[PDB]
Design an enzyme around this catalytic site. Structure first.
Site, mmCIF file in Angstrom:
data_model
loop_
_atom_site.group_PDB
_atom_site.id
_atom_site.type_symbol
_atom_site.label_atom_id
_atom_site.label_comp_id
_atom_site.label_asym_id
_atom_site.label_seq_id
_atom_site.Cartn_x
_atom_site.Cartn_y
_atom_site.Cartn_z
ATOM 1 N N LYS A 98 34.926 24.660 35.608
ATOM 2 C CA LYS A 98 35.876 25.394 36.450
ATOM 3 C C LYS A 98 37.086 25.831 35.622
ATOM 4 O O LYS A 98 37.590 26.961 35.867
ATOM 5 C CB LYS A 98 36.287 24.506 37.631
ATOM 6 C CG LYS A 98 37.499 25.012 38.386
ATOM 7 C CD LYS A 98 37.693 24.237 39.691
ATOM 8 C CE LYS A 98 38.948 24.590 40.462
ATOM 9 N NZ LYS A 98 40.187 24.354 39.695
ATOM 10 N N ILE A 139 47.486 27.516 45.047
ATOM 11 C CA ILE A 139 47.918 28.888 45.377
ATOM 12 C C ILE A 139 46.691 29.785 45.479
ATOM 13 O O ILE A 139 45.816 29.747 44.579
ATOM 14 C CB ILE A 139 48.849 29.445 44.297
ATOM 15 C CG1 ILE A 139 50.054 28.538 44.093
ATOM 16 C CG2 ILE A 139 49.281 30.855 44.695
ATOM 17 C CD1 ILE A 139 51.026 29.020 43.009
ATOM 18 N N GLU A 195 46.621 42.983 41.486
ATOM 19 C CA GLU A 195 46.229 41.636 41.067
ATOM 20 C C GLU A 195 46.659 41.374 39.627
ATOM 21 O O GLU A 195 47.256 42.218 38.943
ATOM 22 C CB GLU A 195 44.730 41.458 41.343
ATOM 23 C CG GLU A 195 44.403 40.650 42.570
ATOM 24 C CD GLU A 195 44.787 39.191 42.504
ATOM 25 O OE1 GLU A 195 45.256 38.712 41.396
ATOM 26 O OE2 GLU A 195 44.611 38.497 43.564
ATOM 27 N N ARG A 207 45.948 33.887 47.382
ATOM 28 C CA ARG A 207 46.617 34.972 48.119
ATOM 29 C C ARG A 207 46.179 34.969 49.577
ATOM 30 O O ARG A 207 45.016 34.679 49.912
ATOM 31 C CB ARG A 207 46.291 36.321 47.477
ATOM 32 C CG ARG A 207 44.868 36.804 47.686
ATOM 33 C CD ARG A 207 44.588 38.081 46.892
ATOM 34 N NE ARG A 207 43.426 38.777 47.416
ATOM 35 C CZ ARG A 207 42.688 39.615 46.717
ATOM 36 N NH1 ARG A 207 42.933 39.751 45.429
ATOM 37 N NH2 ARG A 207 41.727 40.262 47.323
#
Ligand SMILES: Cc1cc2c3c(c1C)C(C)(C)C[C@H]1C[C@@H](C)[C@]4(C(=O)NC(=O)N=C4N2C[C@H](O)[C@H](O)[C@H](O)COP(=O)(O)O)N31
Ligand SMILES: Cc1cc2c3c(c1C)C(C)(C)C[C@H]1C[C@@H](C)[C@]4(C(=O)NC(=O)N=C4N2C[C@H](O)[C@H](O)[C@H](O)COP(=O)(O)O)N31
Ligand SMILES: [K+]
Ligand SMILES: [K+]
Ligand SMILES: [K+]
Ligand SMILES: [K+]
Ligand SMILES: [Mn+2]
Ligand SMILES: [Mn+2]
Lengths: 497, 496
Positions: free
Chosen positions: B388, B168, B279, B170
């Protein structure tokens, strides 16, 4: 009225449906405190134990959770409001503003009466046996029966002119003695040390339980050095507190107190005190430490006397509704009298009475032409070198879009506007509150340091102004859209707001 | 198909749970749909299904808001997430994260190819596509465009063909045939874009699948390892293969029962203005766009009665807080275990706005190491903050095994009473910093570097001889005989 009489206050809670009359026998050994503790953890009605096992000759009933929270969001602070002649719907700000109200107006000095309800009964001298009274065991690992969790110590300076009222814990230590905390920088300790310096071994003292509710609130508030709480309380109430002289000494106590102990605080003698399940949510089994000895020479009390009890610990009890919040009130006033642009302060419940959030007037901040790193240091220097800042280890600076009385807004601002480390100033040299476990049971000096000011104002708030919009219903949709949604909400099948 | 394997089945599961409002009145995709969804997320209400979106035409589209937000009943708080994963509605957050981690340790169940599926029921192709004419939502009033993509799955494959990533990120409509969206380091979509860039490919095959099998969208939000294709991991969670259909216009594969699929390319050269966007941390900065890569759409295929899912993200509580920090916490837990650190559990407290992770320590194992908080905190941060999985997390809180890391109240209690500010903290100035957090991008130091901390909220004795306090609470400060006498009298005496 309820703010001026503990007995009236109890009936006000009954009238409000905020009181359970427990008429079944309840053991003061743990059971009463366990009920109280669960009330505090669930924001239930205050428990009034009318049938305490071992009570004799009117000593005593017990009221638990006298200033804990109610479960209705619209009357959450109502039990605190009933201490102060405020409506049950009063906000936390209304309560702190009322407690600060007496710092800008003349005291209303107490008036003397020749008797009162507190003289209805007495026990004197050799007839006193504190170990035979139903003093509660408040937590299973406590070092003794903490009779004193919500009474007012009365002690006067050597010149006779300053009489301090304050709450400090004490436990039964023997037939005629208590032991209890008398710690720096508290006024009971300042006055103890004044007497020690002129060679007094036993200081006249009284401990009054079930005092006028305005008086117990002031007893928990760090009002200025040398200011007698009685006159401050009078100014909050707009009328005098009626005081009666003690029988065995020259001190005065509220005439309608439930129970008064008259005696002495030693400068010379200490006894093991604690441990005690305390305001931060901890007890350390077996960990006593020496504390001063109080000797009791007379008890006077009302017919059907009530002992108030704070079963303090994890959220939410008197130690978080009163200690942190009243410190926050005084920190707000101190910041304003330092010239800092602070409008409001609160002690978020999430901080366990160790945090205070300070709301900044950002228009004024911009006019002061400063920056977060300079401002955070100046705020800590102002607050952490004063008595009112002693118990608080983290100050969070927030702008004036944040409701400091709402822990969710404070946490959001902290988590998203304060860069860890970068935006914090740490204070290693200031007095540190040893009772916090990370102090007395931690990695550095128990009595020094461990404090921080967290700058949770975004950089532009110091210069050009707020340049974001919240991603929330209130701020990311125009009023026309908000009004459409609110008008459709229930018809569409959503829960009433 | 069961709800974890079909978005359409999932919508019916929510309807059956009493967790969905069918809105049949007209709702404007320009702010109104997102305003309703935003208020659902702020009050933990039922998911809104917009069956009458103004400007919907030839089957595009209905909107489902708040697909993985919270329910108001404490006993079923995570029920909408549990319905993604074939868990009961009473599932704990730990049950959910444990289920997501379950595929770490079992072989992948590889997807199976089918010749067709519901996603092929309708199509719009080439010059008939006008993304500006579709009812893409304006999600916040100060957004820089219509964020069509808040809860779909980007599909992109490495040059060697071996790694197909599902994630996912945006994206907003940017023209008749284009989206613009975030393709940021260190995310797998950006790693793969950079591999294509390095060999000179201008237009990378891509697809974006909306209303994918709920198990697939959960894995799309989880930072599983570099080079691991989410499809086989998703199969391992679901206990059976995801059925995939090939795209019509490229060689990528999408779930056969997706609601809506966009097929096209991701450019390695072309950029367009992107954002701002309201956000995950609760902020939008009006007017602040930044160039982002261009996606070109060449075909749309969709189900009859297609549903576009929408996350109206922002202040608590929406998909960005129920999924992003929580699934990162799950992976951080396993990273710490592979490093041999004594971590048993991890969660992202809601209070931290998806920037905090609490790590639960096995204190028996810790005591065997004869270490101290200062040394231990540094080692934990050195492991987590250069990986990460730790990128979006700025504060790790170490707590002992008497703290429930899934309970924000217990985490805050431990943080406030067991971590001496400064003294018990290790700050990290040199690690990658998550610029999206306001105090980074709009703060006093480098937007992309530092601003992290490990907070040691273990008390000193926990490292040496053991826990030496007891809680001043009902559970721990009163014997069972007294606890039971109270609980047995509680309602009779007049308590709630
Ligand atoms: C509302 C309350 C206030 C308390 C305490 C408690 C309650 C309920 C109990 C007894 C339950 C727990 C302990 C916890 C402990 C902190 C202490 C104490 O033992 N020692 C201390 O020095 N201060 C205490 N306070 C705070 C104190 O009253 C205020 O600091 C006040 O400003 C002092 O008055 P002066 O300014 O005039 O000096 N206790
Ligand atoms: C559940 C969710 C996850 C999101 C985002 C959102 C939602 C709802 C929305 C779209 C609403 C908001 C933004 C916010 C933004 C953080 C971003 C994004 O735009 N860029 C990004 O790179 N990561 C995002 N993620 C997290 C991402 O999916 C995970 O990090 C995942 O592990 C990536 O898969 P790979 O490991 O295989 O690389 N978005
Ligand atoms: K006082
Ligand atoms: K800041
Ligand atoms: K993923
Ligand atoms: K610590
Ligand atoms: Mn005082
Ligand atoms: Mn991936």
């Amino acid at each position: 009225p309820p703010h001026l009489s503990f007995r009236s206050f109890v009936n006000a809670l009954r009238q409000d449906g905020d009181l359970v009359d427990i008429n079944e026998p309840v053991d003061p050994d743990l059971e009463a405190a366990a009920i109280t503790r669960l009330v505090c953890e669930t924001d239930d009605k205050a428990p009034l134990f009318n049938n305490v096992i071992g009570a004799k000759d009117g000593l005593w009933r017990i009221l638990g959770a006298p200033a804990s929270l109610r479960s209705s969001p619209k009357e959450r602070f109502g039990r605190l409001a009933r201490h102060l002649a405020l409506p049950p719907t009063a906000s936390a700000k209304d309560i702190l503003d009322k407690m600060l109200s007496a710092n800008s107006i003349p005291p209303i000095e107490p008036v003397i009466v020749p008797t009162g309800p507190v003289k209805e009964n007495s026990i004197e001298g050799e007839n006193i046996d504190l170990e035979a009274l139903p003093a509660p065991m408040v937590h299973q690992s406590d070092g003794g029966k903490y009779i004193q969790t919500y009474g007012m110590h009365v002690i006067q300076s050597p010149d006779g002119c300053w009489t301090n009222w304050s709450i400090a814990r004490a436990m039964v230590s023997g037939k005629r003695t208590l032991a209890g905390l008398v710690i720096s920088p508290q006024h009971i300790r300042k006055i103890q040390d004044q007497w020690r310096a002129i060679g007094q071994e036993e200081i006249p003292w009284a401990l009054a339980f079930g005092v006028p509710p305005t008086a117990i609130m002031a007893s928990s508030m760090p009002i200025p050095d040398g200011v007698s709480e009685a006159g401050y309380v009078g100014a909050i109430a707009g009328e005098p507190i009626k005081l009666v002289k003690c029988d065995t000494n020259n001190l005065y106590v509220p005439a309608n107190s439930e129970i008064v102990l008259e005696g002495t605080l030693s400068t010379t003698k200490m006894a093991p005190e604690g441990p005690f399940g305390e305001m931060h949510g901890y007890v350390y089994p077996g960990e006593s430490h020496p504390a001063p000895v109080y000797t009791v020479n007379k008890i006077t009390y009302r017919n059907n006397a009530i002992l108030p009890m704070s079963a303090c610990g994890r959220l939410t009890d008197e130690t978080q509704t009163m200690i942190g919040t009243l410190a926050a009130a005084e920190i707000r006033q101190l910041c304003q009298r330092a010239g800092l642009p602070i409008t409001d302060a609160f002690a978020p419940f999430v901080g366990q009475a160790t945090w205070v959030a300070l709301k900044v007037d950002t228009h004024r901040l911009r006019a002061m032409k400063t920056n977060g790193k300079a401002f955070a240091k100046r705020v800590g220097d102002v607050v952490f070198t004063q008595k009112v800042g002693y118990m608080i280890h983290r100050l969070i600076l927030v702008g004036d879009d944040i409701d400091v009385y709402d822990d969710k807004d404070v946490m959001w601002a902290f988590a998203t506007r304060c860069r860890p480390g970068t935006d914090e100033v740490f204070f290693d040299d200031v007095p540190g509150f040893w009772l916090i476990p990370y102090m007395s049971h931690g990695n550095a000096e128990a009595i020094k340091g461990g404090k921080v000011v967290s700058d949770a104002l975004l950089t532009a708030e110091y210069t050009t102004g707020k340049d974001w919009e919240s991603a929330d219903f209130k701020n990311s949709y125009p009023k026309s859209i908000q009004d459409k949604v609110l008008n459709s909400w229930e018809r569409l099948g959503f829960k009433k707001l």
